[model samples]
Target: LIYTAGGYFRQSLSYLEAYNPSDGTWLRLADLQVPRSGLAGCVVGGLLYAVGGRNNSPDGNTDSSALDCYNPMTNQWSPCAPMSVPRNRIGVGVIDGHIYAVGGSHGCIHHNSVERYEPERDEWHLVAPMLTRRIGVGVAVLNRLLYAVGGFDGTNRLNSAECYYPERNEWRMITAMNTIRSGAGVCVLHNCIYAAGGYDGQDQLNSVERYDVETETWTFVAPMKHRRSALGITVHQGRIYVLGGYDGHTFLDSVECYDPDTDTWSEVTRMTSGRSGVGVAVTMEPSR
Candidate 1:
């Protein structure tokens, strides 16, 4: 099943929805307890985990440190221990049974610091810091290493990339992306990390690129049909799927899928509503 959680926007949905591969349909599930946008999510041990993002406050958009989890078996949402710092566009990935929360922002400040969550303990711990500050970053775990892709650093959109090694508790710079991307949709597919559409500081981008671990290099790929940023992306059935995001002028409900073998992108389907800064993930089937 492919799941997409709450999105960011003044009137964003706090709903959690899942796509059924069997019938090619989506079913709205439970809603988020702490509704927010710009949050990061991933499935660990069959549970869907929602990390930090910006919460709507009476005063203004508040940087949040909330952590929420969903259990498909019970079809319910629950609160978990929050992170140490407020994060508005966090990047999350799971490595070796632990979830790593990467760069994001709190108020006017972008962060390079990272944290790790142990599900068994229901707590978060500080990890090594990133080399440069990043918010709206894309993160994934590949081959036991945590990879963080391009994002904004309060001043500039980034083209830089880096990866963390758990054994050393350190990070090393990796191949930089071809295009600067903040709020890019990134996921691993066919052993390659694909970085999709994002904001390039000046404009919403339609460009896409991928990093090959074998070559330690970045390569340009076919671009999406519509320029978008803050999109939700995940791999399903060996293909890459990018969901609703904001095109420069309007919010989008369009969904596009990429077939790596042919290097082709085609409009697949649309979400129930348009949204940006949504978190997407494909999860393990629940054991009955």
Candidate 2:
């Protein structure tokens, strides 16, 4: 089961949808409690959790601290503990049963603050902040450490990368990316962190790169066919799937698949509609 949640189409949306690869079908699911965009979500313990995002209202766009959890069995959503600070364009990753919410924009300002959510305790506690203040960062957990990738730091797009060690409760800067990017799609595969297309302040990008944990290096990889920003990315069946996003001229419904073995990307079936700032997850199908 592949799930994509709330995102901006014509306006801020609350709808949720799921795709069943077995029959190649898409099904509509329950709507989100709060309509939003720029939110991040991940699965922890077989449950889906949505974190900070922004709401577009009559007045203007406003950031939210709301945290919502969804149960697939009941197809219902329930509120959880909200974040201490309201933000949008956040990055989330799970490690050892705890979810780490990384950098995002608060009051439209870039933030370096990081927080950890403990599901058992139903509480969030501040952790060591990042070395750089950023929004639209890409986060992934590999080697039991949290890695924060390229993002915008209020003034300029950043190529800097860093990692957080739980034992030390500290963030250390690592090798910078070859291309500066924000709002990119990042995921861990084969013990390497892959960063896909994103925005570079002046233009959208189609370039991709990978970080090797063993060598502690960033290296360029095969680029995607389309330049994109705010894309939905996930890994399934040993391939990387890049979904809907904005491509400078218009929003996109295109989907691309990347095979590391072949080192190439090929166009796949497109979504029903174009969207940016969407949440995507790959989950196990319910057993018979």
Model 1, position 181, has a per-residue lDDT of: 94
lDDT of 2 by residue, 1-288 (tens): 777888777577786777665566777788998888888878888888888888876667889787888888778889889888987988988899898999899875789999999888889999999999989999999978999999989989988999999889999999998899999998898889999999998988999999998898888899999999999888878888888889888889888989999999998767778889887877654333
Candidate 1, residue 242: Cα displacement in angstroms equals 0.6
Worst 10 residues of 2 by lDDT: 279-288
Misplaced by over 4 Å in model 1 are 57-60, 284-288
Residue pairs with clashing backbones, model 2: none
| Each model's lDDT | 0.88, 0.87
How many clashes (backbone N, Cα, C below 3 Å) per candidate?
A: 0, 0
RMSD of candidate 1 to true structure, Å: 1.6
**Candidate 2 — what's its lDDT?**
0.87
lDDT for model 1 comes to 0.88
lDDT of 2 at 89: 88
Q: Worst 10-residue stretch by lDDT in candidate 1?
A: 279-288
Deviation in angstroms for 218 in model 2? 1.6
Clashing pairs in 1: none
